[PDB]
Amino acid sequence: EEKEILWNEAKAFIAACYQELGKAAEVKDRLADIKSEIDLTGSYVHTKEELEHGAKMAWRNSNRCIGRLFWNSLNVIDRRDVRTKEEVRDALFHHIETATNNGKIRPTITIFPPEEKGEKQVEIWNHQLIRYAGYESDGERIGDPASCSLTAACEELGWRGERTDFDLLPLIFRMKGDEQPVWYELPRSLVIEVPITHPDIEAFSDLELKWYGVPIISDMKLEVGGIHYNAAPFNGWYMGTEIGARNLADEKRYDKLKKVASVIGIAADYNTDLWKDQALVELNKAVLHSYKKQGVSIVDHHTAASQFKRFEEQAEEAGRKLTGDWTWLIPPISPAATHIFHRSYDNSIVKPNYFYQDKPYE
Ligand code: HEM
Numbered sequence: 001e002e003k004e005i006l007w008n009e010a011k012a013f014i015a016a017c018y019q020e021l022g023k024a025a026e027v028k029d030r031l032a033d034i035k036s037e038i039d040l041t042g043s044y045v046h047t048k049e050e051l052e053h054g055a056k057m058a059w060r061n062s063n064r065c066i067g068r069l070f071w072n073s074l075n076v077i078d079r080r081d082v083r084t085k086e087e088v089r090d091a092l093f094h095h096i097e098t099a100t101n102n103g104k105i106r107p108t109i110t111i112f113p114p115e116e117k118g119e120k121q122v123e124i125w126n127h128q129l130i131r132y133a134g135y136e137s138d139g140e141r142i143g144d145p146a147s148c149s150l151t152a153a154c155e156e157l158g159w160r161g162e163r164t165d166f167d168l169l170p171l172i173f174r175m176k177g178d179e180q181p182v183w184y185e186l187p188r189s190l191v192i193e194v195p196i197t198h199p200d201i202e203a204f205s206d207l208e209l210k211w212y213g214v215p216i217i218s219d220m221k222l223e224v225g226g227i228h229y230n231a232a233p234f235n236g237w238y239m240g241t242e243i244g245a246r247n248l249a250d251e252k253r254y255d256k257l258k259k260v261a262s263v264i265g266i267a268a269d270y271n272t273d274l275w276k277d278q279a280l281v282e283l284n285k286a287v288l289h290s291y292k293k294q295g296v297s298i299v300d301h302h303t304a305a306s307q308f309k310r311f312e313e314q315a316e317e318a319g320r321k322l323t324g325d326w327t328w329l330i331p332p333i334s335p336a337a338t339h340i341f342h343r344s345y346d347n348s349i350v351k352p353n354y355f356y357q358d359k360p361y362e
């Protein structure tokens, strides 16, 4: 039954993958090999070629991602060979370094061994590999509130944060057979951070804002042809709005709009003044300016929408169905200035893909 669902996913994925790779003729024999392997072992092992194309297809199928034009240049690092916590730590360190590439960010995924009996081999607790800690002590809020529960779990495990607004969470993951995860502090030399300044308004630096260079999503499951890669962190570069319209602006995150309004010299008193709107624009301008000034890759929402239009045209030229989730594709500032806003998208889930999974803490 679980075997049968594996077999059906496998058939469907190998046919589609080999067709795209111009290897349709090899499908029958590879399917035959896979069927026997599943028969004997209850599973099968992807070739390097299948794994790489599988991760790329998965990105291509990610409905919520505006960045999919560049799906075929994903850098796929195959770490199915790891067995120890030191090898895992060093793989994650290497992912950070190679993905960061001195600011010229490379879209990269590192793939650790997959689940077996739905038993995880490696379980990553971090939401992103680089993320800030969050604290609340009777009314007192410090850092990123979205990290509050992970931070509390790390501090159970013997870690202690400095209670700055920008403490870097350690890497935290658990190996099969261990009851408790392990944690390792990130080497600062690997982590690029960007101070946020504004191109025209000198006082903007009085806010002492910064953000990290690379978003490396580390808690989603990569599913390829029935195989469950629960531990497979991946990164791109940011779209500016993700930092300037959510991470630094949202009231449940860093909540900086009133402070922004003050430093850009407008009143924050009347809804009709559109002070939040103006503050959002200047903060988003600041974020783009700052990343560019420091040599760290970033894209603005207009350029990203333009790139996505090319992605839509490319799907159509290749005779592939396009899927998308309009609610995430539209940027959260000036959405109607993009073509995305003015059309609709089929939100069907197609595999391979990246999926949410339950968190081991909370
Ligand atoms: C190369 C630069 C990249 C840019 C600029 C980009 C941009 C985005 C943006 C703007 C979102 C929407 C987030 C939001 O509204 O809060 C998104 C979501 C997503 N992206 Fe991309 N992305 C990039 C690379 C990738 C890569 C390499 C992968 C996987 C290999 C990927 C997989 C996803 C997934 C799975 C989501 C939805 C996440 C969720 O549901 O929580 N992205 N990305």
Ligand SMILES: Cc1cc(N)nc(COC[C@H](N)[C@H](C)OCc2cc(C)cc(N)n2)c1
Binding pocket: 215, 216, 217, 234, 235, 236, 237, 238, 239, 242, 327, 328
């Ligand atoms: C409910 C909700 C809606 C919405 N639009 N966004 C969120 C939270 O999104 C937080 C981040 N922006 C997401 C997880 O990042 C996606 C992402 C992944 C990758 C690989 C690159 C990139 N630039 N951005 C939550």
Ligand SMILES: [Cl-]
Binding pocket: 215, 242, 247
């Ligand atoms: Cl983020």
